[PDB]
């Protein structure tokens, strides 16, 4: 239930808002996965 | 055999080879789609490795995965309507392709 | 004369099919696609029936089934056994509705 | 028609082999040798497959096996049953890796 | 028979004798390599003297030493891959040459 899913179809505003929160969470998860801090 | 005949024969041969190549690409895409569907929606017991160990042909593996996906997703009423029969054991073919397209639609709307 | 008897049997069968389709279409789609007004607009009986069937598909059958089972998004030229499958799926949809 | 059926069987066999080779090559060698980009660069399907096989040999099979079993250090022209043996040895190497 | 035919016949004969001499040198090198391999990596019981006392032909001695070296160095999976079979008792030949080349590679990487 995230906006990144093409198949996702929000039935109402509340589901849309929940998808927004899920999308933000998946993005920060993805950001930390891709993050590689420079040592030294 | 004149020059026009030579040219048309060459063009026909080239088009035939291109069509064969496109058919090979289509078969590769079909195999990839079957593998993805089996991995995503079907149990590990239906894997190509174990099926080959049990001694089933590749086409048999594809049609078995298709039939299992149709039974899992497409409702029995839809099966009895499109395929005109409840049993799918002898419906491999274009009707099976239509059924698996319906199953893909079903999983897309389920997601 | 039995050949004509069987022809009349087929005539009755298709007449019953047409009557059922019209009766359900009047209560499902609209009054604008009524047989009388379509005839006034100048469409043959078979054209009226196929147009009503296509509207039934466009109302009940979702677009994904149209572009997957029937291989084309547009029902404008799909008529035939594919159209029969589409109207059967529409009947299933209205039954479950 | 059974001759064409067996031809289709062989077609499916080589298609499965090609799919397996491509799937393992994508995760083993690089994305630069993808089928789409190679086709854009203008290589036939068989040329793409043999190039991928040779890259697999150059990645897994050590050079000594190439210059001893295949009798030549360069895999540029060794294609055939020797190439089949080389890709089998590469499969063994990736299995033990 | 003209002068050109005489010259080409003479050249063909000379090249044939040279090729025979090269073949003799190759056989001598093969015998030396087999002797070195048997002395270095295989037990004294497989010596040419004791094998000849037991009554085995020279080619049999060479292929036996090769098979023992392949079993000792080349892994069973590599044998089953290259030779398509586990048993080596009927694989003497070019496949045996490939196997002993693989065994030489194996001992080189072992050292």
């Amino acid at each position: 239930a995230s906006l990144l899913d093409s198949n996702f179809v929000p039935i109402n505003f509340t589901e849309f808002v929940q998808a927004i929160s899920n999308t933000y969470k998946q993005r920060r998860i993805q950001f930390y996965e891709n993050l590689k801090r420079h040592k030294r | 055999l004149s020059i026009n005949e030579r040219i048309t024969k060459e063009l026909a041969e080239v088009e035939e080879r291109e069509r064969i190549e496109k058919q090979l690409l289509l078969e590769a895409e079909r195999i990839n789609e079957i593998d993805t569907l089996a991995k995503a929606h079907l149990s590990n017991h239906f894997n190509k490795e174990v099926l080959l160990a049990k001694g089933y042909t590749l086409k048999d593996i594809m049609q078995a995965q298709r039939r299992e996906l149709v039974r899992k997703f497409v409702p029995i009423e839809q099966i009895k309507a499109i395929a005109k029969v409840s049993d799918i054991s002898h419906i491999d073919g274009e009707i099976l392709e239509q059924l698996v397209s319906l199953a893909k639609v079903n999983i897309k709307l389920r997601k």
Side-chain angles (χ1 to χ4, degrees), chain A, chain B:
Chain A
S2 175
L3 296 186
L4 299 189
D5 294 328
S6 302
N7 290 318
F8 168 63
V9 175
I11 314 175
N12 53 70
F13 205 69
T14 307
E15 300 187 2
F16 175 58
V17 168
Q18 297 306 304
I20 295 179
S21 295
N22 299 1
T23 298
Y24 279 131
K25 184 176 182 179
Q26 299 175 5
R27 283 217 307 180
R28 72 191 185 70
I29 291 175
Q30 185 178 359
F31 165 83
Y32 277 124
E33 290 173 359
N34 286 319
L35 170 76
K36 33 180 182 175
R37 301 160 172 288
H38 169 62
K39 303 179 186 183
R40 303 179 182 181
Chain B
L1 290 193
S2 188
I3 177 168
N4 61 319
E5 317 182 63
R6 173 71 171 168
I7 303 302
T8 186
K9 193 262 288 182
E10 178 181 1
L11 266 296
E13 185 51 55
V14 164
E15 292 295 326
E16 173 77 1
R17 306 223 293 290
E18 293 311 311
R19 181 180 181 275
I20 296 182
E21 197 262 1
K22 297 311 167 300
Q23 181 181 0
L24 304 188
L25 311 179
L26 182 62
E27 301 306 296
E29 302 324 296
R30 288 172 60 186
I31 302 301
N32 194 1
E33 290 176 301
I34 295 297
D35 282 329
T36 58
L37 291 186
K39 278 192 170 302
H41 322 302
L42 299 186
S43 172
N44 52 358
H45 177 64
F46 298 87
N47 195 0
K48 293 205 305 189
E49 278 77 7
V50 285
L51 296 192
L52 277 172
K54 280 190 281 298
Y56 297 128
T57 57
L58 194 71
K59 54 165 192 307
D60 190 60
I61 297 181
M62 316 287 101
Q63 59 94 0
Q65 301 315 298
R66 289 187 178 178
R67 288 179 183 174
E68 189 183 0
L69 287 149
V70 172
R71 297 172 181 117
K72 181 201 181 319
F73 293 120
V74 173
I76 186 53
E77 293 179 350
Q78 270 75 359
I79 302 171
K80 289 172 171 178
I82 307 301
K84 299 143 294 184
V85 290
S86 175
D87 300 298
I88 298 169
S89 51
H90 315 116
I91 322 295
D92 53 301
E94 308 88 359
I95 303 169
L96 186 58
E97 172 55 60
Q98 296 174 334
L99 288 183
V100 305
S101 70
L102 181 57
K104 293 166 71 66
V105 173
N106 189 293
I107 190 50
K108 289 162 191 171
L109 61 93
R110 186 174 189 178
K111 182 174 302 181

